[PDB]
Design a protein around this ligand. Sequence first.
Ligand code: NAI
Ligand code: NAI
Ligand code: MN
Ligand code: MN
Ligand code: ZN
Ligand code: ZN
Lengths: 337, 337
Amino acid sequence: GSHMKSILIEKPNQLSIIEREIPTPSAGEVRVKVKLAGICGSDSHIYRGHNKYPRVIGHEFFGVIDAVGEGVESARVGERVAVDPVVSCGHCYPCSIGKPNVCTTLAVLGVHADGGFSEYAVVPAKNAWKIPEAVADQYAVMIEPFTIAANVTGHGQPTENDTVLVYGAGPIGLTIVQVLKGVYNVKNVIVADRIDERLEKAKESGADWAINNSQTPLGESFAEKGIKPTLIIDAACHPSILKEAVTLASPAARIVLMGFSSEPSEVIQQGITGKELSIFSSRLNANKFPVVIDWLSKGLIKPEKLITHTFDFQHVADAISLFELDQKHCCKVLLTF
Amino acid sequence: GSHMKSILIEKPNQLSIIEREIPTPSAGEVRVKVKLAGICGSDSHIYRGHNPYPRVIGHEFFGVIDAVGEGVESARVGERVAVDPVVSCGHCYPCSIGKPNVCTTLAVLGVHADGGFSEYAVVPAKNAWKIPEAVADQYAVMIEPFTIAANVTGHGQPTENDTVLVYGAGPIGLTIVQVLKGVYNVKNVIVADRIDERLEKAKESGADWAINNSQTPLGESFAEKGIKPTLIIDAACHPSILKEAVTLASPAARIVLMGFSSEPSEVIQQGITGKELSIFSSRLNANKFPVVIDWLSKGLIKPEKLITHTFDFQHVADAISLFELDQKHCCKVLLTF
Ligand SMILES: NC(=O)C1=CN([C@@H]2O[C@H](COP(=O)(O)OP(=O)(O)OC[C@H]3O[C@@H](n4cnc5c(N)ncnc54)[C@H](O)[C@@H]3O)[C@@H](O)[C@H]2O)C=CC1
Ligand SMILES: NC(=O)C1=CN([C@@H]2O[C@H](COP(=O)(O)OP(=O)(O)OC[C@H]3O[C@@H](n4cnc5c(N)ncnc54)[C@H](O)[C@@H]3O)[C@@H](O)[C@H]2O)C=CC1
Ligand SMILES: [Mn+2]
Ligand SMILES: [Mn+2]
Ligand SMILES: [Zn+2]
Ligand SMILES: [Zn+2]
């Protein structure tokens, strides 16, 4: 009982399950014995080396505090916790205005520092959020994805009367549909994608209109119904999208970007300022764990709709493969411990 | 006594002082006998045919009500008023959310409909705002330009500790500087411009640091001082500025765009979302006349610092030309009646 297994990305396309000493938490830290972890695009991108090595990945994880560091209440041992991967300094400009997600010395667990694809992880005490007993383990592991939705909608401020367009019906887009419908009671949620199976999944998650734009552009589809969205959320993120969103938008609308493309987006300010559009962006989460846990308590969102597969962590390579290849029928994939 | 002179743009590059019947206000309207009007860029653009007629121009004007239409209190006759050029429908989506400035059927006086470069003009009664006796005629006529500043800062929400960069020390940029300093008590207002004489005017209006970036890019000067603005306002509006603003921005910063360039701006989303920037735009004003009128009562802004020249309205062609030439010694030009 002195060592543990961790999934390590040594370099692009080298993933090993290595054995490590069980870590001790320092002051202000806790150790989590991990139960579940989720697979996200960022895990794939690090594995396939699209961007520091070696790195244990995984920023979506849930488990039980088995030990606490100095200055942490030992009563916390035994708590069921989901971990916010955003590690912030708490004193820089972004931190001072409640934006730890863009902290000047931001570290994301499973990205810039070792994360949750590991039998034990040491994390800041304040980042480990207690999950109510009524909230199932599998829903808890999904908190981090839903905090992305919470952060995005927090910028957009959806109203019940908004006409909302969401580009993309992957995992991310779907959590957003769920928050729009179940938390904000938006009456008209429109979702766009090119894959019919994902559009069906969007409907199942509460979309009012699932529109395929692989052949007919949204402009034609919308012109026909007289639709001009008042809130547009880009959960697809190809850089050409922003320019179309601007055209589609109602005057006075707002747009939320989620994409990190290093490729240029071309826009014409005449089209933006002429409609006095607002363009927000969203990165990670600004302390959204409490509110999402609240939503889970109230049954406002439905993670079971999005979880499609579960692999033991030893099969992580298989899990990631499936996640990469299977656009239909695969949504969110979990690793067990 | 039944006729009056108006300034008509018949077509591109053709300005004529014509004779017209003194108009009669209809229901909900008043006739204003104009005392002062201001010249703006949009007046020049309409004169020069920059939008690929005929129109009486002038959206910045002040005068006295001398007739009222049906439904308007007859007591308004004799009122000193400045006119909000924003004419909105009141029932479309933007109007319903308090954004008449982008009303789906917006008409701007002096742009889409006949304006204030005229001895008399008829306008909606609700658009004519009573000016306190203590506020001078030439201050009152400056209300519309200051409402632009009010609208912009409304989006930006400047705080005292914000590090603000304003691009452009033309008349628009200068109103922004005054509002930042005098209304929001921003401690650090930085202004960039290519012309030294205007940078000097920026200082006179309250700017804390006036930087010429005609030769040295702002990136260099900012790097040297360790400056990363938290609020960036583009009152210069060349389409390339946005991309530069994004690189200069602090993380979590916001940017307010004011430009209507039909040429493309290139931005890279990596740089926007990476810092979770918000990009606002501002057009005209959303009911900011009372706000600015209040600022004037309280002495928070100083319009006299911006007024450089006055011409009788018959010399408008000379006036506009001087406004178009001479960036050095000309700021805001008024027409008298
Ligand atoms: N905090 C943040 O900003 C985060 C951003 N992301 C980003 O969100 C995006 C979505 O993530 P996932 O759902 O996991 O990806 P995904 O690739 O599974 O889903 C994207 C979906 O968008 C669709 N799509 C692509 N172009 C489209 C267009 N022009 N119109 C309509 N649909 C279109 C695709 O068919 C695909 O179904 C990714 O680009 C990712 O980088 C992901 C996590 C956090
Ligand atoms: N509601 C709105 O959105 C309104 C927008 N505008 C726009 O605001 C802009 C400013 O109007 P004015 O003050 O009358 O224009 P102006 O031409 O008098 O002033 C613009 C200033 O920007 C400077 N400039 C240009 N490129 C620059 C760069 N890369 N860096 C730093 N400085 C730069 C110029 O030297 C000039 O002094 C115009 O483009 C106009 O179209 C004007 C009125 C209302
Ligand atoms: Mn995630
Ligand atoms: Mn103006
Ligand atoms: Zn910080
Ligand atoms: Zn309207």
